[PDB]
Amino acid sequence: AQCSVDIQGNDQMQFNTNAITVDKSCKQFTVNLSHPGNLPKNVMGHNWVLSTAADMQGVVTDGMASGLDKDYLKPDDSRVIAQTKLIGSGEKDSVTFDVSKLKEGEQYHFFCTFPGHSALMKGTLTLK
């Protein structure tokens, strides 16, 4: 069984997927984020952040207020189920999280919190 996904965030402010499914039989799930392109992190940095859909807008708003020095994520945000760091182009970051943290009968979204990106870089995450 597959318990990981590889996702690209590129210089056109896009994730290459907007829907991720996690098999409920995985104990852990790994997101491998890569950022192809040629822009530095301070122009077009991308992260991958998972929260409930109801928490998403707040996560994003608080992350932009947190600023570039904090990867545009509030530190220790307890609305964040899992996150990569912010990466510039040519970089990669993976996050692994326990599938036991997703609730059956909750809605989840992933997104990038770099300012403005979540209009395009957002998607759903579901248990299969």
Shortest CB 27 distance to Cu ion, Å: 29
Angstrom distance (rounded) from CA 85 to CA 71: 7
Q: Are strands 49-52 and 4-8 parallel, antiparallel or unpaired?
A: unpaired
Q: Is 41 in the site for Cu ion (CB under 5 A)?
A: no
Q: Is 111 in the site for Cu ion (CB under 5 A)?
A: no
Among 41, 46, 74, 109, binds Cu ion (CB under 5 A): 46
41 φ/ψ angles, rounded to the nearest 5 degrees? -60, -30
Q: Which two tokens stand for residue 21?
A: 């499914």
108 φ/ψ angles, rounded to the nearest 5 degrees? -115, 145
Shortest CB 17 distance to Cu ion, Å: 14
Shortest CB 67 distance to Cu ion, Å: 15
Task: Give the residues lining the site for Cu ion (CB under 5 A).
Answer: 46, 112, 114, 117, 121
Binding-site residue positions for Cu cation: 46, 112, 117, 121
